[PDB]
Amino acid sequence: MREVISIHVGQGGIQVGNACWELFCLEHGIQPDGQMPSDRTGDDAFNTFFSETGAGKHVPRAVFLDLEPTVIDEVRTGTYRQLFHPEQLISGKEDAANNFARGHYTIGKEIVDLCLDRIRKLADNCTGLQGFLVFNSVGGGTGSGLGSLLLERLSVDYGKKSKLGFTIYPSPQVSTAVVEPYNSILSTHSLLEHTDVAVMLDNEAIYDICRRNLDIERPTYTNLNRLIAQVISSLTASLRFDGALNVDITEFQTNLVPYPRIHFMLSSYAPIISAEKAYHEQLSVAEITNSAFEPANMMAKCDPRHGKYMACSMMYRGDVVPKDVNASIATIKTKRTIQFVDWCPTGFKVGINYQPPTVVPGGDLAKVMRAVCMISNSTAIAEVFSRLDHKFDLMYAKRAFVHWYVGEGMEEGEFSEAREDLAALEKDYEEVGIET
Amino acid sequence: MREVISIHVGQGGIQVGNACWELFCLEHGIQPDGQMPSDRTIGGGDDAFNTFFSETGAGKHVPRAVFLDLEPTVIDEVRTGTYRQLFHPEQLISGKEDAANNFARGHYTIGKEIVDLCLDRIRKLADNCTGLQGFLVFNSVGGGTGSGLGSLLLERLSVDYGKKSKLGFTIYPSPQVSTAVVEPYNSILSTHSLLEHTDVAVMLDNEAIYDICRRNLDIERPTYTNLNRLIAQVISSLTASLRFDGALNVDITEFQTNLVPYPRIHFMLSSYAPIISAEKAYHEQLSVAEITNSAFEPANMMAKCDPRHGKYMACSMMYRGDVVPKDVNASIATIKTKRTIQFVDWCPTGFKVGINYQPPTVVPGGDLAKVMRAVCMISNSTAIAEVFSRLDHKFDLMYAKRAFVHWYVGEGMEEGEFSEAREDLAALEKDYEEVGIET
Amino acid sequence: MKRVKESYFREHPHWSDINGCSGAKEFEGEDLAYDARIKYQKETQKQWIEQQIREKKMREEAERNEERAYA
Amino acid sequence: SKKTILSGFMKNNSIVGFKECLDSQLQLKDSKSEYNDKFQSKNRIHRDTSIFHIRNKSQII
Amino acid sequence: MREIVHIQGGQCGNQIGAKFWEVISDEHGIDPTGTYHGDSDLQLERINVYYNEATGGRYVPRAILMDLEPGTMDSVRAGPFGQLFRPDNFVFGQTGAGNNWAKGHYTEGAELIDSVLDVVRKEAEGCDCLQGFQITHSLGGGTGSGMGTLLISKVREEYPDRIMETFSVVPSPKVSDTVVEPYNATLSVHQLVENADECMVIDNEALYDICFRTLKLTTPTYGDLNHLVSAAMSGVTCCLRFPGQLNSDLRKLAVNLIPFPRLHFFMIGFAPLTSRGSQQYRALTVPELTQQMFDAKNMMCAADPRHGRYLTASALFRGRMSTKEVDEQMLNVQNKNSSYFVEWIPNNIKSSICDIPPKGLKMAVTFVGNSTAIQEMFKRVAEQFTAMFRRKAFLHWYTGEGMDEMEFTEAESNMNDLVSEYQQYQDATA
């Protein structure tokens, strides 16, 4: 009776939702056609993600948005053609061309109304709506712009419903576009006061994880999407599987957000081990939680050793026992390389689930009986904000590429106020981090 | 629940660790693939393998060791050797560029790129352990990368861990026979480093073992392999009492509490007996008295030094086999009665004896004969100053005309660190000379 | 959510099984099955090792034939 | 095959909560009424006088 | 006669209640279908204390199950003996509290407790001669501590003369699972001191110690921890259901344990508890039971009783035993440890005897002790509260639901006030 609605906007959001929904279908046993696996053989656990249509198949509680017809048309052609509602894969006619102003003032206005129609058409059906999940690529025009418009409209239309954001900021030095700081800072302004929880998913860190652990020297976007889907499944499995210590979606904001302004945080996962050397180690809960807190395993390119810890939420799925979790937490607390802020004596919220992680054919991970996904709030996140700020100031000093944004209806003063908002956001973190 | 961690850095360290781990695997029954055939053992319960090996949770066993080097030839040889399925793939850390016999290269330029990985590996290994006894390190001192990485690792561990004991088996250059030409410089620098950061050091110079192999084993052309086998036998005899039950059990803690009079003096010589070929074993009886006499006679010293030129500050000897406390007491009494060997004045009793029941094991293609009695002797004597003085003279004759110093100065190390190292050495010989005088 | 399993492995016992439990003598926390369970899990996981490595090898060979054909 | 077998005819001609009451409440024999428990018993000219006092507390209803 | 009704709230409260009813039912020989199959009159003589009789000769517990989320009572029906409870007694919300004291005490629990208050009124008035209430809940959670205490406040104003009993799981800093743990724990003690007649504190840290050290069982789990608490709960009211040499109900314990009205926080323990490998070495005797009973490591609380002075103590012995042996041991322990007992009250131990031991046992005893060392538990909770509240961390949810900072300041002061006025009797001299 509890439902979460996933919003996928932009090419990155679509391509991560593909893996997420493939993982969900495989984990719940639903065929790509949308049916139970043939005439070979319900626990009513699929209700969190799927809904019964009254005759046979299930329909995912998702909506796809894009202005580029290519990805959506190719999805429609693909083998998951019969799974989604035909009018849930909303597609545009012209791309925003990496322009935030286009997708926020010119093109996205003719599609946001239809998206709102579809989203309320999905929301009125569910009775126990837990919240919303949104996936978008920040370094993209239509992605950031449409995400901004959707968040702004959803806030006023719904009020107290929680929203979770899994954004992908540009990497510190490695990227694919040349104008991404602009729409990056603009979307940062848009989401700062509109999203309740933001989870950092920089690509460079995931490339590092793959190279170091999975021993893959030729990785593509598919591996990154599979890892993100595993993170999402580990986060959500408490809402649909029995466990010894349950945590609901409403029980994350109330434990990881000390103040309303500060809700930016990064995630981690463990174990991430290739099958060639996977279980030639014991994978006790102690070493998997040690690997999770290891700084090199951060899913975002940040060093927690450079700042204090605010709060930590970690969830174990498998055959863990609370006493072992307590022992591991005590060991981590006694460890000196990791330090917590003074006004937070206890900073761990633990959840336990008995559903072991599922494996996908053609994947890279190994079939574990134990796993842990940890999301932490720390003051060290400000380094990415600082390095992103420095990049923007270089181009903006010489009016570089500004005429492309001004000519699309955006006022000149937007950049200055966005810079001020980044400055204030940085203002918050260092002030709260210092000892009283 | 008692564990040790072995550290192998440099080509000599890797080649010694190969033989050491082969001997340990053969002793505890683990096959090269890592899967134990499984048995109910013959001594000290089924927990014996816990000291060196850790259960991997799914099948095999993984040694508590880490291998460090910058030249990848030996590492690749190990990875393609018979033990490829034994060691964890990520604990055999290898570099790309060798230090090229340059202590400055191995300590200032291309060391930081490996020390972080090594420290991460050591931390993750120590997390598994519960009753970690201490660390064992093996390194060739005459090699640039070996000496530099060992010194930097000791510097890092001294502040990372502290109270955990660290043991060292160093192989000093021989008095006249040596391979390289610039080894005095890095030997002096490495001693200057390790004197302040090594709890216990053991001298393992080549020539003594060379002469031992030439004399006792009747083999004219052995190689480094046999030397490594002898060193592995010494290590196993030293650490057997930790994992095998005995009449008198001596821990790692009961070495520094009975062998080092002062923290400044911790340099020791080793000796092992009996070691003789199976051809000559057909004749003599191999009693405890004769084996301890062979251990004490100077020509059997594992280091090229003569104990007759100094006093014995303390001696540690561990017996394995079917030895009896009464007979070892008889041997000790005879040794004390003998006038050729003399002890320092302020040491009325200078023996710490340990007894273990398991007789030594044998290695295929070996040279040592399987015997029913053995003893390994560790002695601390003031005669150690002679090798330090000889190396000081060699280094001074090196440095009189300022040769080979351009590389060291240009690699980042300042020119005159040799002066400070020489001062530390001279203080060391002065300390040894002043300690041994009668009250 | 629900707590329908006391632990990951052993389910809730039958009512006839708990004959006493008014006086604290049987706690069913002493396992009496830990060693055999973990021993079985060892080989259970070893089989997964072997399988996954097999599909992996198949994947690299399938990759290699492609570059051979292009050559 | 859980709620997809549904039809209009089946629902509107089905009673869900007002079907027959289950057992443990059926336990009244319709014929037996009052004036038949005692005035239709059988009656005696010489009764039995034995009465027993048990060492068990009387159940309360 | 003199029967009690049971109330359990929250995920923690339901789990403790479920194991408790399994213990009681098997003690009285009641099958999961409610049909008695015991062996004696005494198993049926006073069964009305805990059970209500319906048509068909079946017995149903008079327990009220309450929570703000439907998952847990979907689970309680999935375990053994899950079909005993009357389905009408189940009350549940649709959203839950989410570890927010304000949400469960002001917004959601307040509008939902009107329903569960009605069913309690139905159960309480139905019985002939009520004795009181007993409540099991956790102070570290949202709905358990928040909406549970409001029920305690509401019920007290309606039945002032009835004994109110509580079993509170006080959160510990050692085994910590929630970041907002100190706030709601501190607030609940404020409401609990003014209403509960008897409060017995329970700590998960202490329960883990007993399993690891005394029982030495390999894998502790909540199934084992709940079993220990359930055994202790049954031993307190054992004499209320069975004959004995010296009878004592809940009211008699309150009179003989509470010197002053604001000192009603006790620590409980159970004996005997032995491991499987040590069962054939011990000897079950009256001297042996009292030796383990007073042991510091045997208490179910994190507070060490050797850091303070006992005020009063109570022991309830079960089984057939001689009265003289019981009385002399109580005198003996008091004489040998005169430094651990407050001196201005002579003979501050009470003894009770019940002739029916727990099934499968010959002798057993439960201990309830009012000690001045319980102030340690509040002190460590207070320091965590004042550390977080100085920087106003994690406060906008409590403030965002109508609560103001004056409530937090007043709650801290009164809890601080209790600690100061509870130590004052430790240093009292005659």
Ligand SMILES: Nc1nc2c(ncn2[C@@H]2O[C@H](COP(=O)(O)OP(=O)(O)OP(=O)(O)O)[C@@H](O)[C@H]2O)c(=O)[nH]1
């Ligand atoms: N991690 C991850 N990021 C992706 C993926 N696909 C696209 N991105 C991100 O998307 C950014 C560029 O935007 P696009 O995905 O091309 O499309 P968009 O965000 O909708 O914006 P437009 O190009 O105007 O359509 C890149 O910088 C990537 O970081 C993906 O599969 N995985």
Ligand SMILES: Nc1nc2c(ncn2[C@@H]2O[C@H](COP(=O)(O)OP(=O)(O)OP(=O)(O)O)[C@@H](O)[C@H]2O)c(=O)[nH]1
């Ligand atoms: N006993 C013994 N000593 C060895 C062996 N191999 C090398 N050595 C010693 O190592 C010294 C020189 O060091 P290298 O073998 O070149 O290796 P290294 O110490 O890592 O120094 P690099 O050459 O810079 O790599 C020589 O003087 C030898 O005495 C061996 O197999 N057995």
Ligand SMILES: Nc1nc2c(ncn2[C@@H]2O[C@H](COP(=O)(O)OP(=O)(O)O)[C@@H](O)[C@H]2O)c(=O)[nH]1
């Ligand atoms: N002894 C015991 N403690 C429990 C049990 N279930 C939960 N807890 C404790 O209760 C705390 C969390 O309580 P919570 O679930 O939030 O209670 P709620 O707010 O009423 O739902 C945890 O720290 C657990 O240690 C149980 O079955 N037995």
Ligand SMILES: [Mg+2]
């Ligand atoms: Mg695009």
